Amino acid sequence: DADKLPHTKVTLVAPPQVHPHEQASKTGPKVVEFTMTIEEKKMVIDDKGTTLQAMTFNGSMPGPTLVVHEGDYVQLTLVNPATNAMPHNVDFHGATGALGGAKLTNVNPGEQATLRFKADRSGTFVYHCAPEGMVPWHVVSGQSGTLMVLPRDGLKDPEGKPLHYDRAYTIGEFDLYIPKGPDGKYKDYATLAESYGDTVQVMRTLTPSHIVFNGKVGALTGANALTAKVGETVLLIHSQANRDTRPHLIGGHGDWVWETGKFANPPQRDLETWFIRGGSAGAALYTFKQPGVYAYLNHNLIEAFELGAAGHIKVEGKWNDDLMKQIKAPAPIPR
Amino acid sequence: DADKLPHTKVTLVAPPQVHPHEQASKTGPKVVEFTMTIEEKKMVIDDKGTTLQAMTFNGSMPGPTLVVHEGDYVQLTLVNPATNAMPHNVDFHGATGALGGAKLTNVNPGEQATLRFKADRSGTFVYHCAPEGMVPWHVVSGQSGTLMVLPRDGLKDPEGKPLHYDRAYTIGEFDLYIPKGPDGKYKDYATLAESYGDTVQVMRTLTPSHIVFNGKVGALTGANALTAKVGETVLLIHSQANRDTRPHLIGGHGDWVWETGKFANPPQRDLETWFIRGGSAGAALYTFKQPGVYAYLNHNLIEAFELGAAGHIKVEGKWNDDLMKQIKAPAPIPR
Amino acid sequence: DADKLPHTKVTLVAPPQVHPHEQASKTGPKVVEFTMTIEEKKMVIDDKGTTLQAMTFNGSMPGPTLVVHEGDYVQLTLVNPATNAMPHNVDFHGATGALGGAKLTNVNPGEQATLRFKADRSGTFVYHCAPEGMVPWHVVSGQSGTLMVLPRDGLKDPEGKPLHYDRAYTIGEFDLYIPKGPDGKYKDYATLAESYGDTVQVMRTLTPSHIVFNGKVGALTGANALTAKVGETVLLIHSQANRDTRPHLIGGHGDWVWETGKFANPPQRDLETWFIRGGSAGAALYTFKQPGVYAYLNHNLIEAFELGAAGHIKVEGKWNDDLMKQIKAPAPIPR
Ligand SMILES: [Cu+2]
Ligand SMILES: [Cu+2]
Ligand SMILES: [Cu+2]
Ligand SMILES: [Cu+2]
Ligand SMILES: [Cu+2]
Ligand SMILES: [Cu+2]
Ligand SMILES: [Zn+2]
Ligand SMILES: [Zn+2]
Ligand SMILES: [Zn+2]
Ligand SMILES: [Zn+2]
Ligand SMILES: [Zn+2]
Ligand SMILES: [Zn+2]
Ligand SMILES: [Zn+2]
Ligand SMILES: [Zn+2]
Ligand SMILES: [Zn+2]
Ligand SMILES: [Zn+2]
Ligand SMILES: [Zn+2]
Ligand SMILES: [Zn+2]
Ligand SMILES: [Zn+2]
Ligand SMILES: [Zn+2]
Ligand SMILES: [Zn+2]
Known part of the structure; x- marks a missing residue:
């Protein structure tokens, strides 16, 4: 029962780095807390000055990598600031149920939500935005990153x-x-x-x-x-x-x-x-x-x-x- | 020697269902008999009324799934009705020899043929039509399905x-x-x-x-x-x-x-x-x-x-x- | 130390054949010597008379297959004749360091070079030309083949x-x-x-x-x-x-x-x-x-x-x- 476990807060870092973590650990299961903020921004992508009307987690492509251990619970607070124009959410391939969490994190500009899921399978897993009717556009415009769950x-x-x-x-x-x-x-x-x-x-x-x-x-x-x-x-x-x-x-x-x-x-x-x-x-x-x-x-x-x-x-x-x-x-x- | 084994007749069902079968069995090897009929038909494929001039096994895309056990023999009767315009045949990726059976099942409209092969390797395997000079067209127009051979x-x-x-x-x-x-x-x-x-x-x-x-x-x-x-x-x-x-x-x-x-x-x-x-x-x-x-x-x-x-x-x-x-x-x- | 090992010279053959070799061997490690010559040539590629302005190793697409055993050293002499117009080199996916050897084999027309590397990993591995600023063109025009390293x-x-x-x-x-x-x-x-x-x-x-x-x-x-x-x-x-x-x-x-x-x-x-x-x-x-x-x-x-x-x-x-x-x-x- 996750309500009874210790909580730890982790600060994310920008790609291509990954935030500090232990590989093999003697620690027991924790509820590991993260936060991310969606940012819509125009960005230059080449040597000729071409721009992309982009969408990101935390202002970067890709979003930051989140690291936990098998048996931990991931608890994410997702914030959609009022300076953005569009609704967003998050689908974690590492999670089970409710379209990977997408159903439980639909946030209009000015809103936020908090999701918890059990990271019960080891590996690297994609996460990405997936708003109903708009899924491919939000993904190819920059909204994806990695959850790594270490054994x-x-x-x-x-x-x-x-x-x-x-x-x-x-x-x-x-x-x-x-x-x-x-x-x-x-x-x-x-x-x-x-x-x-x-x-x-x-x-x-x-x-x-x-x-x-x-x-x-x-x-x-x-x-x-x-x-x-x-x-x-x-x-x-x-x-x-x-x-x-x-x-x-x-x-x-x-x-x-x-x-x-x-x-x-x-x-x-x-x-x-x-x-x-x-x-x-x-x-x-x-x-x-x-x-x-x-x-x-x-x-x-x-x-x-x-x-x-x-x-x-x-x-x-x-x-x-x-x-x-x-x-x-x-x-x-x-x- | 397959001539000496018991024969069983199986009735196919339409996708997405698969016909009833046993997983682990105590039965010994059988000659398992199936029949399929080619159908050429125009079909609507989207919400805008677009049509495809299609070709199918048994009137469906995909064709029905055939299930046997490793060591069984598959015996297929393939019928090409006179209401069709084109010649057809069948290539089983699960079979050995004669272009997967294609060489032995060339049927003009009004004709049928019967093929037997040993299902000696376990897995799911594609079958598809493959008439000489016309192979990609018949396949992308709808003529494929699956043979499953269970251990x-x-x-x-x-x-x-x-x-x-x-x-x-x-x-x-x-x-x-x-x-x-x-x-x-x-x-x-x-x-x-x-x-x-x-x-x-x-x-x-x-x-x-x-x-x-x-x-x-x-x-x-x-x-x-x-x-x-x-x-x-x-x-x-x-x-x-x-x-x-x-x-x-x-x-x-x-x-x-x-x-x-x-x-x-x-x-x-x-x-x-x-x-x-x-x-x-x-x-x-x-x-x-x-x-x-x-x-x-x-x-x-x-x-x-x-x-x-x-x-x-x-x-x-x-x-x-x-x-x-x-x-x-x-x-x-x-x- | 490779300087101290016996040397063997191998004569290459044209695809689709592969030059004679032993599979399991009782021999110890050798320095195995090969030579190849780049050829630029226009070539007919279809039934309609279409031509490709091609680039090859030894005048063939693909280049010949080179075979050695794990622990051998490959020693290649690469020749770029003065009848060619362009510079060339070679990148062996089977090698470690210096862009697979590309950095050490840059040969203008009229020049040659000799490279040695340890074949310390078993498998089939691509080799291809890779001149700075021109890599995809030289590869899709025909400059690739295989190094096989047998256990x-x-x-x-x-x-x-x-x-x-x-x-x-x-x-x-x-x-x-x-x-x-x-x-x-x-x-x-x-x-x-x-x-x-x-x-x-x-x-x-x-x-x-x-x-x-x-x-x-x-x-x-x-x-x-x-x-x-x-x-x-x-x-x-x-x-x-x-x-x-x-x-x-x-x-x-x-x-x-x-x-x-x-x-x-x-x-x-x-x-x-x-x-x-x-x-x-x-x-x-x-x-x-x-x-x-x-x-x-x-x-x-x-x-x-x-x-x-x-x-x-x-x-x-x-x-x-x-x-x-x-x-x-x-x-x-x-x-
Ligand atoms: Cu989004
Ligand atoms: Cu997904
Ligand atoms: Cu056909
Ligand atoms: Cu095939
Ligand atoms: Cu080249
Ligand atoms: Cu390469
Ligand atoms: Zn708690
Ligand atoms: Zn807390
Ligand atoms: Zn180390
Ligand atoms: Zn942990
Ligand atoms: Zn849907
Ligand atoms: Zn019989
Ligand atoms: Zn019978
Ligand atoms: Zn069950
Ligand atoms: Zn059976
Ligand atoms: Zn052919
Ligand atoms: Zn020597
Ligand atoms: Zn020598
Ligand atoms: Zn043999
Ligand atoms: Zn050798
Ligand atoms: Zn570079």
């Missing part, structure tokens, strides 16, 4: 041996549907409501104009690249709430991967490229063995390099000649 | 423990390619043959005009919703003979899922969203824990809510506050 | 029992993006460089004009069909460096399949249709039980029969009435 004794390999990560990163991939005018340029809209009709027409073609990680082309590059060091194990959480994608680390691998994202199932090893089904989140572990700049991308290479689905990981440390060596540098063909 | 001792979890279902439902998902005229409206054709040329042009774009469950937008809603009750375990068989899809139950899960559809392999647990490869059938078990109306859909949400790939399950019983509770209903933000 | 003690089933093949075939599937002129006919270009701008526009639609096995529509049919005999076990290696596909053998199955292509993971059995993620290679074993002509195809049937993704396997031997029998041939419906 109480931490992650395990197929033989039951312990696995860990030293840091976690959260990547949300967004297929966008931006309309064009008769001059062939992308349209800019003064309000969210004015974008709707034209956007639905693009959506129905099933062809995205852009596909981006974390809100914009190049979001995870330059000063905002992911970082690690040789010897460190990273967890890469990848969510796609609407469309299939195929993650790959250039010069690396997926050492242990749950591509369907559910930790009670055995992971697969040595993957070159994995698969995240539209409407889910998956998770991969990698231990860095070489320093350098890696690319992390969707391996439909058109989707990555032409449409925006790619980022960088900068890795410090010492180069290893045993794994890889330039025997002869580029030079003229001998004659 | 003789019933379904099993990864550790070999017994699994059961209390009822089975069969869902066939159909990507449709309906042409449009110069006024932008969908075309209506007087004959099946007249639809061919325009339809192939649409097919080659790889973009469906509609994606429907069981023959029409909203087929599995209102009076025709699926039903269950709290405590009941349902088997959801999902077939897609031509295109990938990603099933999801809103407010539920896949407790045990064979997404590739082959029962001798261990299932996965706790899935939010699973994946059915174009040209296959898969199967999921879920035990209901909460009452209410669930949605069952393709989680490319555009494909579901804009193009038609979604249905309803109405579930009776008692609400459970431990799994999910509204702590505070929607109300004004405190000030 | 030293051969392939194994989920219980650790031994598995073998009697012959191996290598199939590379290529999504092509051929532009059209205002008359609706495919364009023919005098140089590789002149095709670039128009081709990128087609690529961005995500809709291929053609999808072919091994370089052309019908490449693996007639005199060039694959062959086997009843009782023989074949390994079918399938690579797709850019786009998802779903292989199927008509009248057959995948007896044991690694659809993600990594041999240290247990295979699945009895598959009707499997799934190769864009940016990977997978592998299937089948033992023929019936003679005849089988089709091997992508089971999006539009992609197979309309766009080109299909081939033939001709199988000799004795027909087996137990698996399949025509009980009654096509004849008039009794009255």
Whole structure:
């Protein structure tokens, strides 16, 4: 009975970071309390100045990642400020009943609600907005993120041996549907409501104009690249709430991967490229063995390099000649 | 030797039901006899009056599900009435040899044939029409269904423990390619043959005009919703003979899922969203824990809510506050 | 330390064959030496005379398959002749570091380079060209193939029992993006460089004009069909460096399949249709039980029969009435 358990309050952090948490814990079940605020905002998504009339949890794409342990209860307060124009709600794939909670969290601007559910299954799970009659629009405009439920004794390999990560990163991939005018340029809209009709027409073609990680082309590059060091194990959480994608680390691998994202199932090893089904989140572990700049991308290479689905990981440390060596540098063909 | 075994005759039923059968059985191998009749018919597929010049097994999309046990022989009589215009046949993915039987069942209007094959591998398997030179057209126009071959001792979890279902439902998902005229409206054709040329042009774009469950937008809603009750375990068989899809139950899960559809392999647990490869059938078990109306859909949400790939399950019983509770209903933000 | 190991030189062969090799071996680790030469060439890809301005390893699509054992080192000499116009390199998904080797093999026309890497993970892995700023174009124009790394003690089933093949075939599937002129006919270009701008526009639609096995529509049919005999076990290696596909053998199955292509993971059995993620290679074993002509195809049937993704396997031997029998041939419906 959840009424009788201790409560803990957690402060969320912005992607691509994930808020501090324990992996294996000796703690018993808790009611874990979070709050999020919906924000409607126009946002620039590329190098040409194109805008998206966007909708978000907490002002970011994706929304922040929430972490609990199997057997905890999630208790979320969802706030829809009066500065917004539209109604919203939340559907947690990690929850059981009432359309994942959507039926119990319908909030008009100026309102809030509080939901509790038991996190009784381990894995990474998508959450997203789902207002009746308007579901695909709110999701492709930016309203999704991840709930991670860790097993109480931490992650395990197929033989039951312990696995860990030293840091976690959260990547949300967004297929966008931006309309064009008769001059062939992308349209800019003064309000969210004015974008709707034209956007639905693009959506129905099933062809995205852009596909981006974390809100914009190049979001995870330059000063905002992911970082690690040789010897460190990273967890890469990848969510796609609407469309299939195929993650790959250039010069690396997926050492242990749950591509369907559910930790009670055995992971697969040595993957070159994995698969995240539209409407889910998956998770991969990698231990860095070489320093350098890696690319992390969707391996439909058109989707990555032409449409925006790619980022960088900068890795410090010492180069290893045993794994890889330039025997002869580029030079003229001998004659 | 099959000539020496007992014969049983089975009467088929229309989707979404599946004909009565035993799961675990003490019976030895039988020759199991079925018959099906091809029907060409024009059909209304949406709320706007759009028509499809369709082709079916037994007058339904999908065709009926045939159920046997591993080691049985399937013996099918396939009838092509003289009221039809085109030749037809059948390819069983569950069979070995002769293009799945297609080579041995070529029937012109006014003709019939009888095929027998050994069902020597467990799982759910697609069957579909495949006449030489005309294969994709006959499949996307509606000619596919499922053969389920159960292991003789019933379904099993990864550790070999017994699994059961209390009822089975069969869902066939159909990507449709309906042409449009110069006024932008969908075309209506007087004959099946007249639809061919325009339809192939649409097919080659790889973009469906509609994606429907069981023959029409909203087929599995209102009076025709699926039903269950709290405590009941349902088997959801999902077939897609031509295109990938990603099933999801809103407010539920896949407790045990064979997404590739082959029962001798261990299932996965706790899935939010699973994946059915174009040209296959898969199967999921879920035990209901909460009452209410669930949605069952393709989680490319555009494909579901804009193009038609979604249905309803109405579930009776008692609400459970431990799994999910509204702590505070929607109300004004405190000030 | 690789400097101290014996070296072996291997001569490559053209697809769909794979060069001779041992499965289980008693040999210890070797440095295995290969060479490949890039070739830019215009090529006819269909029955209508359409051309592709292509780029290849060794003059073929796909490039040849390279085979080693886990713990061997791959040492490749990559040559870019002065008759070519563009720079090239190589990224091995089987390697660790420096963008899979791409950073260490940048060769302008007139130049060559030599790379060594440790093949420390078993499976089938894609290799492809990846020059900075030009990656998707070089890949969809034909520059990809497979590295197979076999476990030293051969392939194994989920219980650790031994598995073998009697012959191996290598199939590379290529999504092509051929532009059209205002008359609706495919364009023919005098140089590789002149095709670039128009081709990128087609690529961005995500809709291929053609999808072919091994370089052309019908490449693996007639005199060039694959062959086997009843009782023989074949390994079918399938690579797709850019786009998802779903292989199927008509009248057959995948007896044991690694659809993600990594041999240290247990295979699945009895598959009707499997799934190769864009940016990977997978592998299937089948033992023929019936003679005849089988089709091997992508089971999006539009992609197979309309766009080109299909081939033939001709199988000799004795027909087996137990698996399949025509009980009654096509004849008039009794009255
Ligand atoms: Cu919303
Ligand atoms: Cu959802
Ligand atoms: Cu037919
Ligand atoms: Cu088929
Ligand atoms: Cu190149
Ligand atoms: Cu790659
Ligand atoms: Zn309390
Ligand atoms: Zn509290
Ligand atoms: Zn906890
Ligand atoms: Zn560590
Ligand atoms: Zn980059
Ligand atoms: Zn008999
Ligand atoms: Zn009889
Ligand atoms: Zn039986
Ligand atoms: Zn039951
Ligand atoms: Zn509904
Ligand atoms: Zn040496
Ligand atoms: Zn040497
Ligand atoms: Zn070797
Ligand atoms: Zn053999
Ligand atoms: Zn053929």
